[PDB]
Amino acid sequence: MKLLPESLQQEAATAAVVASWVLWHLDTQLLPTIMREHKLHACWAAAAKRYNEKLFKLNPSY
Amino acid sequence: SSVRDVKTGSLPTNFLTGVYRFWRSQNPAEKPHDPVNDRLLPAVVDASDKRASIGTWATTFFCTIISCNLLGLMPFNEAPTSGLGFATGLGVSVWATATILGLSKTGFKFPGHFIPGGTPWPMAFIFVPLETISYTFRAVSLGVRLWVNMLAGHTLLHILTGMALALPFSLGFFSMVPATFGVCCLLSALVGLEYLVAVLQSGVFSILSTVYVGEFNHDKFIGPAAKIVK
Amino acid sequence: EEEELWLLTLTQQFKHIQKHFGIDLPHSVVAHMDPLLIKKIDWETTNALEDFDITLDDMGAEDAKEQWGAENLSHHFLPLIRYRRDLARKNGDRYGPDLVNG
Amino acid sequence: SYSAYFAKAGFQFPAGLSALVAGIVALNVCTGRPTKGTKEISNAEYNATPIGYLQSPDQHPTAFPKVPGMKDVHGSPHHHH
Amino acid sequence: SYSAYFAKAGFQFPAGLSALVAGIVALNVCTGRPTKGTKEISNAEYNATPIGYLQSPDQHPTAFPKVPGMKDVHGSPHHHH
Amino acid sequence: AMTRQFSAPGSHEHHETPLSKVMPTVVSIPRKVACLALGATKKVVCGLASSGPSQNLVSTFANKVIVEENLVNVAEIDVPFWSYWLSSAGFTSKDAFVKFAEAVKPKVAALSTSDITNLTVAFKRANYYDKDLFTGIEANVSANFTKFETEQLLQIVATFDAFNHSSVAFLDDVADSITYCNHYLAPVRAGADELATLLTYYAKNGHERADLLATVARGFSEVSLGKLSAAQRKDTVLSALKAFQTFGFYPESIEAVIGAALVSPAEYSAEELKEVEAVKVAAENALGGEFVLIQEG
Amino acid sequence: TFAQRLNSSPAFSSFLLKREKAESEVPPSELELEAAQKAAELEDPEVALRTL
Amino acid sequence: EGNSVAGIIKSVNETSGANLLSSLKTIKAQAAPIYPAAASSTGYSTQAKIALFGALSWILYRADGQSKAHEWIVDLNLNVLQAAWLISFSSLIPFRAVYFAFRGMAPATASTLNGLKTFSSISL
Amino acid sequence: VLGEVYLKDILRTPPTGAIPANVPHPFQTSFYTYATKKLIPRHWYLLGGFTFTITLYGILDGLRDSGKKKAYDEAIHAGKTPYTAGGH
Amino acid sequence: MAVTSFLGKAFEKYFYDFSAYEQFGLNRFLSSKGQYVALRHVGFVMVGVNVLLAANFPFNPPFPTIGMCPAGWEGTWVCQADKAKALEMYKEWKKSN
Amino acid sequence: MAVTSFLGKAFEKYFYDFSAYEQFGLNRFLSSKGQYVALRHVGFVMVGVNVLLAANFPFNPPFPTIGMCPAGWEGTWVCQADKAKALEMYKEWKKSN
Incomplete structure (x- = not known):
């Protein structure tokens, strides 16, 4: 059967290229989008208690 | 120059989000002794800088390997990880990456971590050389385990399919069905196992990376050198 | 009617987001409506702090987690304090929240 | 509500997919060595050689061989023994 | 007056230039014969052959030869005479 | 054979380094490691050569590139761009910076935050003060304080501290930008x-x-x-x-x-x-x- | 309703979700249904003024 | 483009009390957020056509090699065995349940957006 | 009264005219910025691991080629055919 | 063009609306619908196997048959073990037929 | 980036505004400006010829020299007629130097 390829360096360079592109794409395209959506909800959920209280102290509407 | 717009709540985004959170959870941050506040915040940021980006790295390897494995299950396609250099190159790159990381911050003390904890000090001598070989053996075994699974499964399917095809060829196409029916079920179940193996191998490889690189993902906390108590 | 504009803006913006977030809200609109929030989130990603909130959860730092989220939305109050500071300044008065003992 | 806006923009490739394919091709064309089943020969030896003799049966397998090992070309019947 | 409108649209290739280049490439890659200076060999003969022997000096001319006829590789020193 | 016989005790002593002095005696007074650290330090100290005489040669290049208006109109292109790199090379000539301020003044209102920052940093290295230029700059910052970044504003403020110049409107706009328009962990x-x-x-x-x-x-x-x-x-x-x-x-x-x-x-x-x-x-x-x-x- | 908004989203317009309904997975509570019905009544600002 | 709230305030302050109630429906529409209408129907995007051509070409290139390969019949039968599982997944997988499963992975979509309350933003 | 000028570029209502273009992230604007701020400062370990592997595999390929050369030259001096036979 | 949009609408109805399990009423015989699709796949496999073999039945098998013959041949070039000899025997048979 | 836009403005002034014929006042010596540019081109050719030759002067010429020698060599590998022999002689000279 086929055991050894025609070039080991060629196969390794291919894998490294693909992995490097995925890493760049993740940091440059995926993570910024994910964090924009994820952190929006998380900040509101974490601040809702202190945010509403601070606002309640500021408006003289009551 | 003009970037595209993205719909919030997109299915690919949500899937990738949970994947990152899952791998990031594999290496949780160590809870400091002091209460986290404005005084401790800069030291926590420093700890994050000393921490490696394993979560980013592990998800990168997971997605790239699972994609290559799933390509081997598509018709008219082969898995890139079935090539010896392709699969082994990833394992060596992981092992080399962890090695370079450890040697950077701790340097000469890196051979130190190799010592097993709680060992009696006189006995220790004969232990570290064997563990050194085991550490260097990870480079091979990590990549070979992935490669063998992609190679042996495809080769096994090849041999068994040749043996299965001999039945309808010899006993007629539509003459008798029960003998070929039973072998078709076994072959169908084997392909189903290959799908599971692809998910298992991509997970195992990423898990092992989080374990090995996590071994050196530890540093002493630069806590407050002065404090106003009470 | 003195500060109604600022209060009505926050209500309108938040309601529109909740009505569409995670369903069909486009990212372009989010940055247009709240550019400062996006400027904060993208900074964390640029400064290798994309998982800062997850780090606080690992150590259970509840007080830091609440402060983090509050500071990320603190700019929502900026228009009100700028207006109230200008009101005091034209009258020569000092704004309370600006003082160390205020 | 915004469903009709997202229907305007069609399918779009990844932001940097072109660079990934470019590297993959370069790794397969700029190998710096003979290409998968060939040997470099002198320019003199290339000009006069008939193309039928310049080919090898193994490099021309049948698309659907009735017998394992069928080749589409016979190559040169002259060897170097 | 409309000068600023024409300045918006930048340089644009001909409407069907892509098809012209595609045909030109196909005529140079799908020649159906060995590629300019090479000979097809059996798959067996390709696997074990060292790449230095699998090359020919004429196919590797020097970029700036100090003497006309300088070659970058020596090839195999073994011939078939 | 003998190679292994020597290799074993060689590694043996190296294994004592990762210990809080568990053995009877390991820590040493000489502390040879200090020499290694100091040796590396000496090399970088030499690397920090100022090459002050070469600053005159750089001045020549600058004069024979942008200063001769006969080759290129200085006011036509981008003062923030060239002045940033020229001052980075040590070219600090007040006479040239005077031409730069007059060339850029009509465009300051249209500069980006990054360009404004680099331009301001250049004038800090030159230690040159132009009241009219700083007036237009502070108006740009006050009009767009939400777009500026703390990393940029800190460099700009450093210039406002080198020469004592301040505005009450500018002081509040900068404080508000850092306190609310930027990430609270940026410092x-x-x-x-x-x-x-x-x-x-x-x-x-x-x-x-x-x-x-x-x-x-x-x-x-x-x-x-x-x-x-x-x-x-x-x-x-x-x-x-x-x-x-x-x-x-x-x-x-x-x-x-x-x-x-x-x-x-x-x-x-x-x-x-x-x-x-x-x-x-x-x-x-x-x-x-x-x-x-x-x-x- | 929240489920009604999802059913109108582009995800449900896809081939594999063309016949799916969000309510089939999680039905909305009575409080949600009555609130959505009330909101539809207050879409007219004149009616809201006379009510308030 | 100015903010819609400022447009409402100006429009309401400038409108007469007699035509206030009748014009409220118009002001409400004037401040409504833009929802782009459906554009003209297009069969396929330019990039989509390239994707189909590239996928077909890759498939044919691989299939041609497999047919010319040794044990060529085995390769073609392996493709059938694999293709059968693709049909099985499309039939067995409860895509609606799976959609909610992935939606439940991300905290931003596993729960509703809990934030600003009404009583805190009342403008009286 | 509070006039829109206090929130000019701070808070904005949802658009009513047309959807604006998406704001590009700094890494999406230029590759140089991402490389200098995150790629090299945080992930340079990965680049080294890939480079070390590629260089190692090139050495292994050279060692493999040297083994073929030794066996090839030995068959030539034995006066034998270095190749067994083809399938045709 | 329209021809492509029409096929999209048609395939949708086939995928969701058209079910042979219901039109033939196989619920009378099969236990669960989830098991019916499993049998339909094994049938598809057996169908594909016979179809691929029927596409060109007169061929020498590359796989090693375990002492069995297809039809009343048993000694034809189709049944030869060594492929080098089989190629010569097939060429003679092919030029005749 | 700006660096490219700057070069465009600079090249424009060079093409139209900067003329060496006027700055040096060659109208005193040359008949017509249309003839001056002709001499400038022949000079450019001669310059390019010498520059390309000076880029690597120690080389055997591929063109047939008509019984002439470059310098006080006349018998070096640079002066050998047949290139097959010249290559051997150059290799010996190169390993020494």
Whole structure:
């Protein structure tokens, strides 16, 4: 059967290229989008208690 | 120059989000002794800088390997990880990456971590050389385990399919069905196992990376050198 | 009617987001409506702090987690304090929240 | 509500997919060595050689061989023994 | 007056230039014969052959030869005479 | 054979390094490692060659590139671009910077935040002051303070501190941008030397902004202060403590500033240490506690 | 309703979700249904003024 | 483009009390957020056509090699065995349940957006 | 009264005219910025691991080629055919 | 063009609306619908196997048959073990037929 | 980036505004400006010829020299007629130097 390829360096360079592109794409395209959506909800959920209280102290509407 | 717009709540985004959170959870941050506040915040940021980006790295390897494995299950396609250099190159790159990381911050003390904890000090001598070989053996075994699974499964399917095809060829196409029916079920179940193996191998490889690189993902906390108590 | 504009803006913006977030809200609109929030989130990603909130959860730092989220939305109050500071300044008065003992 | 806006923009490739394919091709064309089943020969030896003799049966397998090992070309019947 | 409108649209290739280049490439890659200076060999003969022997000096001319006829590789020193 | 016989005891002694002196005796007085660290340091000290005479050669290039208006109209293209790199090479000529200010003044209103920052940093290195140019610059910043970044504003403020120039509208717009329009953790990446410059600028202007002070104080820490030169660290501490004492604001993070001085008091004089302890007791009364030094172990 | 908004989203317009309904997975509570019905009544600002 | 709230305030302040109630429906529409209408129907995007051509070409290139390969019949039968599982997944997988499973992975979509409350933003 | 000028570029209502273009992230604007701020400062370990592997595999390929050369030259001096036979 | 949009609408109805399990009423015989699809796949496999083999039945098998013959041949070039000899025998048979 | 836009403005002034014929006042010596540019081109050719030759002067010429020698060599590998022999002689000279 086929055991050894025609070039080991060629196969390794291919894998490294693909992995490097995925890493760049993740940091440059995926993570910024994910964090924009994820952190929006998380900040509101974490601040809702202190945010509403601070606002309640500021408006003289009551 | 003009970037595209993205719909919030997109299915690919949500899937990738949970994947990152899952791998990031594999290496949780160590809870400091002091209460986290404005005084401790800069030291926590420093700890994050000393921490490696394993979560980013592990998800990168997971997605790239699972994609290559799933390509081997598509018709008219082969898995890139079935090539010896392709699969082994990833394992060596992981092992080399962890090695370079450890040697950077701790340097000469890196051979130190190799010592097993709680060992009696006189006995220790004969232990570290064997563990050194085991550490260097990870480079091979990590990549070979992935490669063998992609190679042996495809080769096994090849041999068994040749043996299965001999039945309808010899006993007629539509003459008798029960003998070929039973072998078709076994072959169908084997392909189903290959799908599971692809998910298992991509997970195992990423898990092992989080374990090995996590071994050196530890540093002493630069806590407050002065404090106003009470 | 003195500060109604600022209060009505926050209500309108938040309601529109909740009505569409995670369903069909486009990212372009989010940055247009709240550019400062996006400027904060993208900074964390640029400064290798994309998982800062997850780090606080690992150590259970509840007080830091609440402060983090509050500071990320603190700019929502900026228009009100700028207006109230200008009101005091034209009258020569000092704004309370600006003082160390205020 | 915004469903009709997202229907305007069609399918779009990844932001940097072109660079990934470019590297993959370069790794397969700029190998710096003979290409998968060939040997470099002198320019003199290339000009006069008939193309039928310049080919090898193994490099021309049948698309659907009735017998394992069928080749589409016979190559040169002259060897170097 | 409309000068600023024409300045918006930048340089644009001909409407069907892509098809012209595609045909030109196909005529140079799908020649159906060995590629300019090479000979097809059996798959067996390709696997074990060292790449230095699998090359020919004429196919590797020097970029700036100090003497006309300088070659970058020596090839195999073994011939078939 | 003999190679292995020698290799084993060679590694044996190396295995003693990762221990809190578990064996009877391992730690040594000579501490040869000090030589290795100092050896590397000597090389970088030489690398820091100033090449001052070459600055004249660089001046020649500058004069034979942009200064001769006969080749290119200086006012037509991008003053922020060329001036940024020219000052980076050490070309600081007041006569050329005069041409630059007149060439850029009609365009300042259209410059981006990045261009404004680089242009301002260039004038800092040149130590050249143009009141009319800084007026247009401060108007641009005040009009778009939400778009500016703390990393940029810190460099800009440093120029406003080199030459005493301030505006009440500018002071508030900058404080609001850093306190609310930027990430509250940005000072950690800023560096204590830039933070002390900003503090001194507001302290000399008497502009009390407790919200700004609470934000800037987060950047001061053992990690950020340890990265500065011993001389620069001393000057940074002595200037930062004066600003805190001027406004009477004593945040908890001030203990890291004081600890940096008390851990190495040999660099400070008696009069400097006296005012340091004066702030220490003042902060101890404000925070309601007692100062104690923490020791590793 | 929240489920009604999801059913109108582009995800449900896809081939594999063309016949799916969000309510089939999680039905809305009575409080949600009555609130959505009330909101539809207050879409007219004149009616809201007379009510308030 | 100015903010819609400022447009409402100006429009309401300038409108007469007699035509206030009748014009409220118009002002409400004038401040309604833009929802782009459906554009003209297009069969396929330019990039989509390239994707189909590239996928077909890759498939044919691989299939041609497999047919010319040794044990060529085995390769073609392996493709059938694999293709059968693709049909099985499309039939067995409860895509609606799976959609909610992935939606439940991310905290931003596993729960509703809990934030600003009404009583805190009342403008009286 | 509070006039829109206090929130000009701070808070904005949802658009009513047309959907604006998406704001590009700094890494999406230029590759140089991402490389200098995150790729090299945080992930340079990965680049080294890939480079070390590629260089190692090139050495292994050279060692493999040297083994073929030795066996090839030995068959030539034995006066034998270095190749067994083809399938045709 | 329209021809492509029409096929999309048609395939949708086939995927969701058209079910042979219901039109033939196989619920009378099969236990669960989830098991019916499993049998349909094994049938598809057996169908594909016979179809691929029927596409060109007169061929020498590359796989090693375990002492069995297809039809009343048993000694033809189709049944030869060594392929090098089988190629010569097939060429003679092919030029005749 | 700006660096490219700057070069465009600079090249424009060079093409139209900067003329060496006027700055040096060659109208005193040359008949017509249309003839001056002709001499400038022949000079450019001669310059390019010498520059390309100076880029690597120690080389055997591929073109047939008509019984002439470059310098005080006349018998070096640079002066050998047949290139097959010249290559051997050059290799010996190169390993020494």
